Amino acid sequence: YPIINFTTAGATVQSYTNFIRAVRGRLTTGADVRHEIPVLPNRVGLPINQRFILVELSNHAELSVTLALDVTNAYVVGYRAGNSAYFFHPDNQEDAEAITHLFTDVQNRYTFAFGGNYDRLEQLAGNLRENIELGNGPLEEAISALYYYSTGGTQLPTLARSFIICIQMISEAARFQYIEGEMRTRIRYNRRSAPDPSVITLENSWGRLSTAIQESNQGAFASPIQLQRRNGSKFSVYDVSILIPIIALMVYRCAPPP
Ligand SMILES: Nc1ncnc2[nH]cnc12
């Protein structure tokens, strides 16, 4: 499977930008684009040898971990650190089999009894996304936390918190140019801060926005979708047009009409 590297050590807006662009390049194939917005591969009929991509993260502490992302949804399904690999609890039998194809060389593979969805991760971490700071420092720290989990140095809450950080700075950033933009800002001024309502609502609405766009009438939504601006005020989305500079890729929801 393809591998994309990134390091928090000396990270700049440009190195982060190159990273995200590279990830998107490996996620999509250019075969499916609706209203100028790329669509991820359809899970149905997708060969297993084209199912995942790897993201190898390194930090100033000279530690490295490798996350595994499902190309059909950019979902982080697990990670490897040295001689151990951990996978979130699969949603179905098909996904449980698919993951057996990842890190086939690791001496110890473990599957968590819990899922990797925010609801569960926030419960384990004992904090919501709105209260978990994001930025290069948090990522640098998160990479160390994941790395030391097998040895017992990392507590469950801290592991969950760390996943929440990696997922947003990698998966959500790849999905939304807007979120990638918020992370670039944090890196540029080396300032850490929790995600505002605009970020949170976008993360929560990806599936619905993907469906609305794909089932739209020439781009026009049948029903509007409400998002939130940074100050928390409501923002109504009625068309795919206003989302072009915001959403980088969508999950496949339906076939494109003639
Ligand atoms: N594990 C995960 N990977 C990607 N996006 C997610 N959103 C919530 N959990 C996620």
Numbering used by the authors: 6 to 263
What do the authors say?
However, we found that the position of Tyr80 in a newly determined structure of RTA soaked in 2 mM adenine was not the same as that previously reported. In this position, the hydroxyl group of Tyr80 can hydrogen bond with the amide nitrogen of Gly121. Upon examination of a crystal complex of RTA with adenine formed by soaking with adenine instead of AMP, we found that the overlap of the tyrosine 80 ring with the purine was much less than previously reported, due to a difference in side-chain rotameric position. The RTA-urea and RTA-adenine complexes also showed similar fluorescence spectra and a splayed arrangement of Arg180, while the positions of Tyr80 in these complexes differed. The orientation of Tyr80 did not therefore appear to control the fluorescence emission of Trp211. Watanabe et al. found that binding of adenine to the RTA depurination site as monitored by fluorescence had a KD of 1 mM, in agreement with our figure of 0.7 ± 0.05 mM.
Ricin toxin is a potent ribosome-inactivating protein derived from the castor bean and a relatively common bioterrorism agent. The heterodimeric toxin consists of a lectin B-chain linked by a disulfide bond to a catalytic A-chain (RTA). Free RTA inside the cell can irreversibly inactivate ribosomes by cleaving the glysosidic bond of a specific adenine base in the sarcin/ricin domain of 28S ribosomal RNA. RTA has a single tryptophan, residue 211, located at the active site pocket.
